[PDB]
């Protein structure tokens, strides 16, 4: 299946993941629109593994789109543009224990 890279749209100097990392966590397919607490809508693609990201702040379950998971904000290591969030399980029974949700508008190609 597709296995080529998704890169930072803003700087185009780093690969973040590959299409073979994409998976469906829920019924809403691998990518869907989610609404944040302030009315910003993020088309979020879920991937198992990502690279070239730096994390900001601490994990939080506030307004988590994926019950049982906490988010940590993730930004491009080169340009610091917001790319998505790392999700980490808050209980052992969950699988996967971690994944990444990447916001569609931050990535090239356009999924």
């Amino acid at each position: 299946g597709p296995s080529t890279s998704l890169s930072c749209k803003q700087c185009q100097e780093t690969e973040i993941t590959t299409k073979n990392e994409i998976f469906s966590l829920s019924l809403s397919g691998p990518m869907a629109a989610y609404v944040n607490p302030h009315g910003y809508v993020h088309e979020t693609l879920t991937v198992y593994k990502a690279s070239n990201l730096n994390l900001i702040g601490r994990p939080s379950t506030e307004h988590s789109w994926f019950p049982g998971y906490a988010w940590t904000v993730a930004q491009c290591k080169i340009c610091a543009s917001h790319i998505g969030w790392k999700f980490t399980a808050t209980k052992k029974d969950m699988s996967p224990q971690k994944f990444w949700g990447l916001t569609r508008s931050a990535l090239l190609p356009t999924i």
Binding site: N36, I56, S60, E62, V73, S81, H82, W85
Partner: peptide, 27 residues
């Protein structure tokens, strides 16, 4: 320690000044 939050992504900051710059960069 990081009381200032970005309303677009949830990024938190110690310095409100850094928040302001971060918000600008979303544009």
């Amino acid at each position: 320690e990081r009381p200032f939050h970005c309303n677009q992504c949830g990024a938190s900051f110690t310095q409100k000044g850094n928040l302001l710059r971060h918000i600008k960069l979303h544009s």
